[PDB]
Structures are given as structure tokens and as C-alpha cells.
Amino acid sequence: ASIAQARKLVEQLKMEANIDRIKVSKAAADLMAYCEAHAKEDPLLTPVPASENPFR
Amino acid sequence: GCHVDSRVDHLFPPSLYIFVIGVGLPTNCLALWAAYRQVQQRNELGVYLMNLSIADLLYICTLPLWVDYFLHHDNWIHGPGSCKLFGFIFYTNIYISIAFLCCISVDRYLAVAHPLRFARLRRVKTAVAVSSVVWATELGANSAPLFHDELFRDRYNHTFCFEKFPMEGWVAWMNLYRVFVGFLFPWALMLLSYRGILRAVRGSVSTERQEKAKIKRLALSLIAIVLVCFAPYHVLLLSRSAIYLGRPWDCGFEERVFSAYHSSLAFTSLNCVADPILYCLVNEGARSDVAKA
Amino acid sequence: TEDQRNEEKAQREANKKIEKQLQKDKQVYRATHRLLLLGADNSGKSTIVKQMRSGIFETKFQVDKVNFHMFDVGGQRDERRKWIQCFNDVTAIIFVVDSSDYNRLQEALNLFKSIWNNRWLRTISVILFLNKQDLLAEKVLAGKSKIEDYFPEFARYTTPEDATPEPGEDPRVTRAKYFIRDEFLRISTASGDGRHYCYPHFTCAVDTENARRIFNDCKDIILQMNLREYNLV
Amino acid sequence: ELDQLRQEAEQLKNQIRDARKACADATLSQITNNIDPVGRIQMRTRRTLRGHLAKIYAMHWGTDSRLLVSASQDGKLIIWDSYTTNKVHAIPLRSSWVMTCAYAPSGNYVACGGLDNICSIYNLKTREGNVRVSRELAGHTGYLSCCRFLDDNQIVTSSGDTTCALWDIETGQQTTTFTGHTGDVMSLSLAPDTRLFVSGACDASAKLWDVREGMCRQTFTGHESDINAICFFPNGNAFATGSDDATCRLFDLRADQELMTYSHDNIICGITSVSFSKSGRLLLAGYDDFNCNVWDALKADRAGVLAGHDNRVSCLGVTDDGMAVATGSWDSFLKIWN
């Protein structure tokens, strides 16, 4: 059983080994761009008039 | 037809009356605020405390005219109707406050003695029903002075207001009722409730003797202050009523007990000081409530 | 629009019906006490539930017209540190202990202490039943194993006063009773400001006296928070 | 052979660490260091929903952005009407220990579950108008933690047995299973395209999955205690996690590494709920300090505190149109902040 669990651990590590990995900075930039692109349409970040606010 | 006396009276009962005017007002309003916040958390004690504070505020507001009553010489005179209403309030608010003290004692006893019972009686709706019933019964039972004029006096340099020393007949029996049903019975129940609370508290397995001692001292203060603040005035009231009922023509008894009657009517106003601080300020949780205030 | 007003009126009628249902729910919810049972495999954790009666084995019992309802979470793994937070508002946590073998009292103390110094269990008055008292009593008396070998403080103690009066006045069994008691009290009575308590009890698997004991201790906890609630301290 | 296999696993882990170290070009805080800070988000309790009896453990909003579901520890599933402060329905539940509730995108059904290890389906928009059970789901050996409606006839469930699974709502079978974690899975989030989903666990690990297949792809390890909450960024990439070590960490898929940490010295208790706004600039989180801190997702600063709850804040969610935040807490109240 320990041998089998070691085999499963090593095969999982092997599949996780070769995954195509790109730079972290690109991912951070993507997150920043998507945070920025939808800023106007966010009521929690831009106040909504009471006329258009169903909760007020 | 009775001669009277006393010179300090110009300021004697006025002294303690001005004292209680000065002290009891902010304490009573902060007690009202704490009561309202207790109501906010679905606690039935808050309604009772708030009504107690309201009655205390009314009495403190209506006191100054009756302070003037003597500052002249037991002789104010501003018309029959004003005296009629203000004497009524000034002699009813004490009994209203004491009835709400009885209500508070009963409510406190209910939770500590029986922690898992009487769910319906521990509700805000029942509180606001019982408080309304109490107000209605108090005004109805004290309404008897309304039918009579309230500007009687004796002919010896004196125009009284709501208080005739050569008193009539009905006022004596209302005095006896006011003492016996109106002072003792609520106070007796108020002492019984804390006796039961102490009996429950001392038998607590999760409470050491330190908390027991602190609770004991608080309960002792609450029960003991009222008796000293109230007893002498009602003793003199009962004495005069009995003497006049036995023999009204013996004016000498009034002539001597004049000083006792109002030097004690002075002391009767100290409960308006006792109740607010001793019910809100001292308690540690209510001290946190005062900090939140 | 008449249909608009009809829709609003239907909204209000449904709202009134749901408000009545919610008030009934509030009453029935406030008139009940929930408990949690936390024992050990060798102990009779589930035994007392049946005695006083996939996943949760719920139980329902009633003492003096007051509703009690405890839950025994046993369809889970060895890990306990997450679903334990569900039972934060219960009246009390019943921690049954496995006082069978000294090799199992150490994790018993560790579990008492981790429950004690927990974020959400410091206000919960746990109940100590000291389950499997008979195994401890019959084997520390028989011998072949010394508590000194596990916790080297057994000998320097004497008979506790009236701790379960025994026909045989054996100091060893009673002082082992209260030695494990004070082992739990090392942080049962050290850490804590009085919000909770320990309520020591000694029970076997057959006592038929735990439901009422829990009810009395619940009365004590409610008395304490009524003392604190009604500004009477 | 066992020692050789252990050495093999060791060198595989070492090479993985070397690859990640090479790929660690920069962190999030370095790049996101020049944008304007959000500032003090001073929201107010516009609505106070007082219908719940016990602490709120889970809530979810419907697609219409008005009808929202909520589950508390008393055993209730109250359907609310936000606009009119009304209650459309009040669904009782078989099991009180509910830790997650789901609202169908169409609105015809509601899903709930918890310690019972069962996911239940109810009937919301019936012809008769009465809510009744439609079916049940069984097959998990641990307590349910999160479940969401995949599109309309599938559902993804998470459990404490270190597994996640996919169901078919027509036939009632567990089509696919996802294994690989070693600790309890706490929170679960779904991508917009409904082709991948991510979940944290109580082992300082996060893993991503493919729904069509049954294979784990990526793992990320950055914490020192149990992870307890996760939410998916709107763009379909990356996520955010909180943990019992009082430090919240942001991850990313293609980076395959930890990016940014939100922490402070004063805060001792950990994060218990995470959610994202419509834009993704705001990062909302619940704490055991009875507060709700508004982190800027890219600045690691406390730019906002949602005071008002006097007990631990457990719930967190945003609307489809982004017009409200619902904050269920251990004070048995639901508040709408706008």
C-alpha cells in the first residue's frame, strides 16, 4: 500500500511537472487589466444615484 | 382654625427639594436611555425602567412650584385649576415610581429564580400592556381629589394650595390609603424579590463568594435606601390622620407636628435620586451601557 | 394598473403569512436547547444517548417540559477542527472522556485543553462525565501499571473527601480519580474568567442519571447569564 | 522499492520547486504599486433583513438580482424580495446544519446541503406555487461545503473527504469524481465558461480541475495553516484564498505560484469568507473580529471596514449587476450595503 501511494505520488508529480508554465508578471498584468476594464459599471466602487438605486 | 409655625421651612423642605431637583434629573434621563437600549435587545426590563424614569422626570419637573409653596410661607396662590392639577401630579408620581420599582423587582426575580419558564410574560408586548394598565389604574385610583376644589385655607395669614392643615374628612382617609396601599405593599414585594434572588444566588455552584458578596451589597443598598427615604413622612402622615380622626379640634397636635410633617416631606423626595444611579450607574454591565451612552 | 395593486396586495398577504410562520418558528426555536456530544471510541459516547433516549445520529429527550436535542457527529474523518465550529451556540458541549488506559488519558487532557482554549468554546460550559470509570478503578487497583510511569505525580496525594463513597476505602482509586480530575483542571481552572465551568462528574456506561444532570447544569448556565443579563451582578 | 520511490518523489518535488523558482519573475505587489488606492469605502446598512432566528452560515443570490436565497442554522431557506423587503417563500429544511445554498440560474430550483453529506433539490417556480423536493443527491462521505448549479441540469459539489464531484440532475448519478487533495475541501468556485473549477483545502493547497475529464492539472501551496475560502475572479483566471493564519493570499493558474499576501500584525484571527466585486478591484473578506475588511485586490491595504455586525461575519456575496453586498453574520441578521 505504501509502495502504491508512492507510485501515485510520483506519477501525479510527473504530470504536474511538464505543465506549460508562463511568467507570473503576465498573469498579474491580466488581472490588473480586467480590474480596470470594468471600473465604471461597478456600483460598489462608483456611487449610484438614489433614483437608479432600488435599495434607496 | 389652627395656628402653625416654623421659620427654616422658608428654606427647610425647600433645601432637600432643591437638592433632589439638581441631582436626580440627569441620572433619570440617562436611566431612561439605558432602558431604551435594553428594550432594543428584546429585554422586558427596559420598558419598566423607562416608565420609572418618565415618572421621575414628571415629578422633578413639577416640584419647583411646590418648592415655592413655602419659600413664601406655605402660601402660593396662582388659581384653583393649576394647583388642582399640579398637586395631583406631585402627589401621584411617588406612587407611580414605587409601583414600577415593584414591577422591576418581580421581573428580576422571574429570570434568576426560574431561568427556563414563563416565556410569554418575558416579552415586550406584555411589558407595554402591563405598564399601560399600571398607568391607568394609578390615575384612576388617585382621581378622587379631582371632584373637590383645591384652594382651602385657615384664617391666620395663610392661603394654602392642595393642603389644608385643619384638614377635611375625605383627605384623611385618602392619606391612610396613600400610606398603606401605595407605600408598604410594593416595598414589601420589592424586598421579597431580592430575598429570593439572594437565596438563588448563594446556591450557585459556578459563582464564588466574591460575586455573592457584591450581589449582596447591591441588593442591600437597593432595599435599604427606600425605607430610610420614605418611612418618617408616612409615619407622621398616619399619626396626624389618626389624631384628627380621633379628635379634630385638638389643634395643638398639628401645631407641634408641623415641623415634623414638612421636615419629612423634604426627605420623601430622595428616592428620585436613589433609583436612577442605584439601578443604572453602579452595575458593571450598565456601566458599559453608560460608556456606550 | 389594477393588476399592479393586486400583485402588491398578494405580496403583502404572502408577507403576512410568512411573518406569522416566522413568529411561530421564533417561539419554537427559543423554547429549545441544543447540545453536542464528544466522546471516544472506547468510551460509551453513543451509549448514553440510547440510554437516555447517514451522518448525524440525532437524539431527542425532554425533562420537565423543556425540549433538549443533542447531535452526535460520527460520519466524519479524524479531523475535527472545522466542523467543531458549528456547535458554538449550544447550551453545553458534552465531552465524554476515555479514562480507560493511561496511554489514552494524555490525549484526553490535550483535547480538554484544546477545547478549553478555543476561540468559540471558551464560553461553552463543558460537562465532564469521566466515562469508563470502572476500567480505571478496576485496573489501577489491580496494578500491573503505575500512573507514575505516565504522569510522575501519583504518589504525593491522598483520599479526596467523599469522592464517590466506596465500600472499600482505597486511597489509590480515589486519588487517581482526582489526579486525572486535576490534570483536566490544570487549564480547566487556570485559564478562563468564569464564563464557563467544568462541572465534574464520574460516570460509567450505565447510570441513567445524565439527562437530569445536563438539565441541572443547563439551569446553572442559564442562571449565570440571567444574572449577567438582568444587571444583577 | 519503497525507499527508491520516496527518493523519486523527493527529486520530482525538488525539480517542481526549481521550475517554479525559475518562473517566479515578479510578485503582484511590485507591478500593482502605482495605481490609485481605492480609499475609504463607507457603505451603509441600506436594508436590514430581520427574519432569521440563528446565525447565517450561507447565502446566495438569484440570477434576477432581486430574489435571493439564504440558509441559517435554524433550518430555514427564506426566499427574499429585496426591492420590496418581502418574503416570496420560506422553505423549511430537513437538516438544520446547512453550510451552503445554491440558487438556480433559471430560478426553478434551489439546492442546499451540509453535514448530512447530501445535496437536496427543491422546486421553486412550480405551476402549483408550493415548494417541494424534486430529488436528492448522495455519494459523498464527508460534510458538504459548497455546491453550485453548473448550467441547468448539472451541479458541482465539494466535500470534506478531499474530493469534488459532478452530478447529472436528470438521472441522479455521480458522473465524475475529482481526487488528489489531502485535507478537507472548504470552498468551491466555478468559471464563467463552466469548464474548469477551483477549490481550496485545509492543507495550504489549491487545485484546479477539468470538468469534462477527471484530472487535476495544477497545485499551489503558499500558506502555513488551513485554507477556508475561495472565490473565482470574473475574467475566468486566478482566484483568492483566506486562511486561519490571518493572511489572505492571491493565486494564479498559469503562474502556478502564490502572488500577493494580505496581512497585518494586529489581526490574529483568520479570514472566513472571500468575494469579488463586478470589476474585481475590490476584495471583500470576513473576519472573526466581527468586521468585514475591504482590501484592494492589488494594493494589500485595508481600504474599508464594514462595521455593524456584533458577531463573526460568515457570509459574503455580490449581485449579478453588482448593485449590493449581502453580509450574513453570526448575529442572525442580513444587511444590504450600497
Residue numbers in the entry:
A (entry chain C): 7 to 62
B (entry chain R): 8 to 300
C (entry chain A): 9 to 61, 205 to 384
D (entry chain B): 3 to 340
Paper lines:
The three proton-sensing GPCRs exhibit different responses to extracellular pH variations, and each receptor has distinct preferences for G protein-mediated signal transduction. GPR4, in particular, is responsive to protons and engages with various G proteins, playing critical roles in angiogenesis, endothelial cell inflammation, and cancer cell metastasis suppression.
To elucidate the G protein coupling versatility of GPR4, we determined the structures of chimeric miniGs/q-coupled GPR4 activated at pH 7.5 (pH7.5GPR4–Gq) and pH 6.8 (pH6.8GPR4–Gq), and miniG13/iN-coupled GPR4 activated at pH 6.8 (pH6.8GPR4–G13). In the GPR4–Gq complexes, the receptor at pH 6.8 (pH6.8GPR4–Gq) adopts a similar conformation to that in the pH6.8GPR4–Gs complex. The intracellular conformational variations result in distinct receptor–G protein interactions on their coupling interface, with GPR4–Gαs forming the largest interface area of 1230 Å2, followed by GPR4–Gα13 (1017 Å2), and GPR4–Gαq (1114 Å2). Notably, L12334.51 in ICL2 is buried in a hydrophobic groove formed by the αN–β1 junction, the β2–β3 loop, and the α5 helix of the G protein, in Gs-, Gq- and G13-coupled structures.
